[PDB]
From a paper:
In a previous study, we characterized the enzymology of Mtb FadB2 (Rv0468) and showed that this enzyme catalyses the oxidation of 3-hydroxyacyl-CoA to acetoacetyl-CoA. We have now determined the crystal structure of apo Mtb FadB2 at 2.1 Å resolution. The active site is located in the cleft between the N- and C-terminal domains. For instance, Ser122, which is essential for catalysis, maps onto Ser137 of HsHAD, while the strictly conserved His143 maps onto His158 of HsHAD. Both of these residues are juxtaposed with the nicotinamide group of NAD+, indicating the catalytic centre of the enzyme. The dimer interface is formed solely by the C-terminal domain. The solvent-accessible surface (SAS) buried upon dimerization of FadB2 is ∼1500 Å per monomer. While we did not experimentally verify the oligomeric state of FadB2 in solution, both analysis of the dimer interface and the self-assembly of the structural homologues suggest that FadB2 functions as a dimer in vivo. The superposition shows that in the ligand-bound state the N- and C-terminal domains move towards each other in a subtle closing motion around the ligands relative to the apo state of FadB2. Overall, the structural analysis of FadB2 in terms of fold, tertiary structure and the conservation of amino acids that are observed to be in contact with the ligands in the human mitochondrial orthologue is entirely consistent with our previous enzymatic characterization. Firstly, the multi-catalytic FadB cannot dimerize in the fashion of the monofunctional enzyme; secondly, FadB2 cannot replace FadB in the trifunctional FadA–FadB complex as it lacks the hydratase domain.
Residue numbers in the entry:
A (entry chain A), B (entry chain B): 3 to 287
């Protein structure tokens, strides 16, 4: 019934956060990547994250050691054969995700197991259709920084098994201590679908010279009590990431207000991607 | 150069808020309503407000009385003749605002005086066009609760005098302690033009059964760290106010995503206006 054996495929920012929160909650976690370079970069992310948490008095030294003791890193996909829940968080590319789900579906043989994707941009039904048992597949969508933000979106396809969804929801709630939000398999789900068009409209105001970057952000923090204004927040999301979600939402829904504005296109093309490149709507030193 | 004598036209929720914060800032304030019944309603708003604020530790016993000491209520518009700044916050109706601004213009004779509108729905140029000195008119847009939210929008028309704008900005910053955001005379200004399409998009999600009211609000609070989710917030803005602002944005810009969705229309027709009627997206006892 209950989930004690978790697998994670991918060890970027999101994959590393998902593995960290699962190990800190006391679950056995196996992290898979195809190459030794990617394993070591993933392990180093988790080690550094946990070292910061210790320096700030949020986790003890023994907690940190216990978490690391529950993490197993491997480049053999067969080490995932005994998992009850596997979460995929790799590059946002349809063909790479389909190949990984075909191979997970063969290797992970427990009929009660769940195969979940963290994707923001590929429809869940498309990765489910890569498997021989599509009823085991769903969306489980997390938010950076995964160890802090207490939310997941749980996305059922047309064929997701009801009992698979209930097991996953109970895991996210009872083990990870997160709030669970349900929705249908539609581009952007709930959170991104409200957030991205709002950020785009702010970018359009700036582009049309209707208000400055500083005044838009000021107006939102003071008037709406958000922690951060939309241009600052676009910079944190990443302008390339914002452009990709916007492109997928336009493709699905065809309404022009979902499409990326010209200023955003010009900034992505110049390499002005926000905080991660050193500049977007603001400069980062 | 410096403002010490302020007039407020109207004593509903916004006008009483504007008078309170000016009196607490140590400026002299005359509040005007035509009918004596409206006057008593206003004083009581302000005394309740100042009491609820002494209750929760916020202000020295005598401050409350210094503030009350600086407020004068009148049913004679000619008492506003000596005002340096007059702020109108009456019913959102073009023909009513026009009459008031034409009279104000005749009564206030100082050429350096400023006549300002708190309106959300009428273009500032239209109320300016009703006066003989249009260069004295601008928008000064506050946000409820006015003694808490530290923001105003300062909206220049095509003809607002530079000196009038700079004096008004200095009053808002230096005297009221508010942040000041500039923009042009366009439906929604900055804040409402970002907020309202975002709220409408949440309502469309609810209407299509894509996610529940509680799940959308949960996702925004946990996911985006907003203090309040969009349907809770709609209930607090008022669904009638939301419909009015959406109607004007649609008339100005003609893009369908600015128009009010059918669920919002039916709710307003049913008298389900949010917190103030006892029911909107949620029930209030």
């Amino acid at each position: 019934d209950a989930i004690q054996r978790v697998g994670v495929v991918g060890a970027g920012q999101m994959g590393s956060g998902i593995a960290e929160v699962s190990a800190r909650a006391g679950v056995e976690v196996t992290v898979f990547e195809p190459a030794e370079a990617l394993i070591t970069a993933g392990r180093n992310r988790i080690v550094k994250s946990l070292e910061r948490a210790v320096s700030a008095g949020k986790v003890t030294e023994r907690e940190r050691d216990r978490a690391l003791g529950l993490l197993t890193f491997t480049t053999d996909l067969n080490d995932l054969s005994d998992r009850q829940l596997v979460i995929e968080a790799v590059v946002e590319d349809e063909a790479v995700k389909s190949e990984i789900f075909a191979e997970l579906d063969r290797v992970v043989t427990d009929p009660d197991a769940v195969l979940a994707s963290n994707t923001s941009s590929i429809p869940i039904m498309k990765v489910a259709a890569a498997t021989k048992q599509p009823q085991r597949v769903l969306g489980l969508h997390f938010f950076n920084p995964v160890p802090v933000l207490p939310l997941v979106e749980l996305v059922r396809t047309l064929v997701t098994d009801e009992a698979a969804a209930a097991r996953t929801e109970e895991f996210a709630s009872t083990v990870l201590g997160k709030q669970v939000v349900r929705c249908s398999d539609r581009s952007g789900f709930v959170v991104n679908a409200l957030l991205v068009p709002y950020l785009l409209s702010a970018i359009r105001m700036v582009e049309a010279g209707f208000a400055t970057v500083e005044d838009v952000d000021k107006a939102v923090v003071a008037g709406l009590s958000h922690p951060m204004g939309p241009l600052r927040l676009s910079d944190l999301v990443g302008l390339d990431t914002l452009k990709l979600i916007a492109d997928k939402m336009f493709e699905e829904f065809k309404e022009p207000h979902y499409g990326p504005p010209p200023l955003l296109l010009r900034m992505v093309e110049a390499g002005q991607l926000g905080k991660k490149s050193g500049r977007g709507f603001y400069t980062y030193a």
